[PDB]
């Protein structure tokens, strides 16, 4: 019953290979991965293939223009644990706090491993 | 009895640029305030005043457009994170505006 | 009747470096009470307050920031003045009640 | 009283197909492929007519020994189907394209298109800013070479919801689009968007759930229930605004006072005083708490993360990203650029002021135009007129900008690729008008 309706939209939107909507020549070529971390690389490269064809007429927008460019204004700092105001920061794995209470309750007893991980928020490993 | 108008330029300094005509000519500062902000040509009085009360970019200051008093209230609270710790007191922006009027 | 807000605590280490010329100076103060302990990032005016009215490792002191004012309370008890290592939180908001007269 | 959240419930409709006798092999098809959701449908209706998710499975029925596949709302029919949906999508590109095929294939079907040797029907498509030429190479393998396409038409969807609210096409303003990977600022002069000022930043809503779901995981670590995808997404939904001033609402969020309204709780499915402690209202909120009950063993406070969560797109390094926010991109393209001196509004940038405009599918949290409004008052000269824009619903302003363009007959042509320049000019050839991309070189 429950069962029995998964097979009736299965039967309801088939495409057989000898495919109705793809053209006569179909010619599919090979797939690789291609992840999106090499896709940034494998560009990156071949903007400095043609900018040292180039050079040895100046190209200007590319893909590192239009990235967003780090502020100019401090950032503020937060408290690692409860996401208000930093006043302190400890010394010995670098994780800022509130007050006391968060201190002794959370960043003294501390295991270790486990301010990679707070760091991890705001990327400060 | 005297009939006079107060006169009050106050917000957070943006650009301090003085130039030559040496003898500076005019400086341009432009102030900022919460409800937007204003720039101002200054005579080289008011700029010697400036440079008394050892004015940087981003001081909360205080402009007396009569009588061309200069009043340092301290630096901007939206620059108070630059060092974890400094000699500098930090006040928040005005929440009006820069030119403000009065008999 | 007006609040000041202050800091105390006891001094653990005071490093001051200095470049090739010396233009910049960097610095990094560490301060503990009783209760909490943290590092603080210093800029020149305060290294310069801090190289005026030496402080050394282990003193208590208490320093305002809005007026740049240091004051050395005295050492604590470390043998390795005498007082105590302050307690409780090294921020504090501080309220005092000031009486002055006519004449003044 | 806590709430119960679980997950969304399921579709008990399939989607319906339509007609196959309006068929016409002259009407475009207005596509929009974006990573969260698919919008497809016919030129001549100015609403799409099928939305669902990007979403494929390869379902395996055991009596009948034949991998099934359901696509979009035919994965919202059992939950098991539903928690192996995959997107094609992986970050801000595509990386495989079977299933892009298998998903193009099904909505060639259910659009109601009876085609032969491919689709008769030019296409309207979107692309990334910026994108890379791999990405657009492979989409002219797929259109021009397996569907037989007679014309292919790209733009930014930013643009085309621009265009959409100024169907003149010669208007000047500043669009912000907030995505799902990510978050663009682009200026557009005389109708035209000048790419060489746009800026990116890589942050979205499918970022801002996972670090919501970051976030909950480190508040309580001994939490004994785990939490999907989806049940992050809707108390991201539901319980997320962007606070008119984040400085002044932290000082005071966790005060007595403020968790008597501000404060939700909801609960996990399953079948000396604490009036001084910071971490204690931090955690278990106004209320003491029994740690001996089973169901407030399965509760989740809400405090302070409402007003945390949707702030990274102003300060990105909250999130860790070393990029500046929506307001100081805004500040530099309005009072550096353009010919405006700071101090000194140009014609140019006045127009642009006068026309800003919010589009894209996370522009839904609330707040979010009143706190743009303050900061550009802020940062502006004294008395200058801003205006700021936002549609009802902004997921759905790229398909009404296909529908706008390809009812106006007279700049479409100026944006169409047919087959013959993609023979002549090969893989590599951009068409340089006002909606769409531009060139890497000068």
Redesign the interface.
């Given at each position: 019953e429950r069962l029995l309706f998964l097979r009736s939209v299965g039967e309801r939107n088939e495409i057989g290979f000898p495919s109705r909507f793809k053209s006569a020549h179909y010619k599919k070529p090979t797939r690789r991965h291609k992840s999106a971390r090499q896709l940034i690389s494998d560009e990156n490269k071949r903007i400095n293939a043609l900018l040292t064809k180039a050079n040895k007429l100046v190209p200007k927008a590319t893909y590192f223009s239009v990235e967003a460019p780090p502020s100019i204004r401090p950032a503020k700092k937060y408290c690692d644990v409860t996401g208000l105001k930093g006043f302190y920061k400890s010394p010995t794995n670098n994780i800022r706090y509130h007050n006391a209470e968060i201190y002794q309750l959370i960043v003294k007893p501390m295991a270790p491993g486990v301010d990679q991980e707070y760091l991890k928020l705001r990327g400060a490993n | 009895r005297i009939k006079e108008t107060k006169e009050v330029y106050e917000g957070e300094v943006?650009?301090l640029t003085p130039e030559d005509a040496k003898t500076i000519s005019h400086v341009?500062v432009?102030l900022?305030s919460?409800?937007?902000?204003?720039?101002l040509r200054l005579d080289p009085t008011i700029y010697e005043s400036i440079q008394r009360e050892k004015v940087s970019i981003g001081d909360v200051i205080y402009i007396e457009a009569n009588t061309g008093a200069v009043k340092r209230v301290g630096r901007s609270?939206?620059?108070a994170?630059?060092?974890?710790?400094?000699?500098?007191?930090y006040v928040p922006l005005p929440k009006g505006?820069?030119?403000k009027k009065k008999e | 009747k007006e609040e000041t807000e202050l800091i105390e605590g006891e001094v653990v280490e005071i490093q001051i470096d200095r470049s090739i010329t010396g233009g910049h100076k960097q610095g990094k103060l560490t301060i503990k009470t009783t209760d909490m302990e943290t590092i603080y990032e210093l800029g020149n005016k305060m290294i310069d307050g801090l190289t005026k009215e030496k402080v050394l490792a282990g003193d208590v002191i208490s320093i305002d920031k809005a007026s740049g004012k240091i004051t050395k309370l005295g050492r604590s008890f470390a043998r390795s003045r005498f007082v105590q290592c302050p307690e409780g939180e090294l921020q504090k908001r501080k309220t005092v009640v000031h009486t002055v007269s006519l004449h003044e | 009283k806590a709430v119960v959240i679980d997950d969304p419930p399921l579709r008990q409709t399939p989607e319906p197909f339509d007609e196959q006798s309006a068929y016409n092999p002259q009407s475009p098809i207005a596509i929009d492929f974006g990573s969260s959701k698919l919008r497809a449908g016919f030129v001549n209706h100015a609403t799409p007519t099928h939305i669902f998710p990007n979403a494929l499975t390869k379902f395996r029925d055991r009596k009948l020994n034949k991998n099934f596949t359901f696509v979009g709302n035919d994965t919202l029919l059992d939950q098991a189907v539903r928690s192996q949906s995959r997107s094609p999508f992986d970050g801000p590109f595509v990386t495989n394209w079977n299933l892009t095929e298998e998903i193009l294939d099904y909505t060639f079907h259910h659009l109601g298109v009876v085609p032969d040797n491919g689709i008769p029907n030019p296409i309207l498509l979107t692309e990334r800013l910026a994108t890379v030429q791999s990405q657009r190479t492979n989409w002219y393998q797929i259109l021009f070479e397996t569907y037989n396409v007679p014309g292919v038409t790209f733009g930014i969807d930013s643009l085309f919801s621009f265009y959409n609210y100024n169907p003149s096409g010669n208007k000047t303003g500043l669009v912000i689009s907030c995505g799902h990977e990510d978050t663009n600022v682009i200026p557009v002069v005389d109708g035209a968007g000048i790419l060489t000022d746009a800026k990116r930043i890589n942050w979205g809503g499918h970022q801002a759930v996972d670090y919501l779901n970051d976030l909950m995981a480190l508040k309580y670590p001994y939490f004994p229930t785990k939490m999907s995808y989806l049940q992050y997404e809707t108390m991201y939904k539901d319980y997320c605004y962007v606070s008119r001033n984040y400085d002044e609402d932290i000082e005071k969020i966790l005060t007595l006072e403020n968790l008597d309204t501000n404060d939700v709780v909801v609960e996990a499915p399953f079948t000396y005083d604490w009036r001084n402690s910071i971490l204690h209202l931090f955690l278990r909120g106004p209320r003491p708490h029994d740690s001996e009950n089973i169901h407030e063993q399965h509760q989740m406070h809400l405090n302070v993360e409402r007003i945390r969560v949707p702030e990274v797109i102003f300060q990105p390094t909250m999130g860790g990203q070393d990029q500046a926010g929506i307001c100081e991109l805004s500040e530099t393209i309005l009072l550096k650029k353009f010919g405006s001196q700071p101090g000194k509004l140009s014609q140019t940038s006045i127009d642009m002021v006068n026309n800003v405009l919010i589009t894209g599918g996370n522009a839904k949290v609330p707040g979010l135009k009143e706190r743009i409004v303050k900061e550009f008052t802020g940062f502006l000269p004294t008395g200058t007129n801003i205006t700021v824009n936002m549609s009802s619903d902004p997921s759905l302003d790229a398909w009404k900008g296909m529908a706008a363009l390809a009812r106006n007959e007279e700049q479409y042509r100026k944006t169409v690729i047919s087959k013959k320049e993609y023979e002549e000019y090969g893989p590599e050839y951009i068409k340089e008008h006002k909606l769409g991309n531009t060139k890497y070189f000068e």
């Open positions: - | 943006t650009e341009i432009g900022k919460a409800k937007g902000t204003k720039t609270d939206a620059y994170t630059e060092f974890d710790l400094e000699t500098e007191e505006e820069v030119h | - | -």
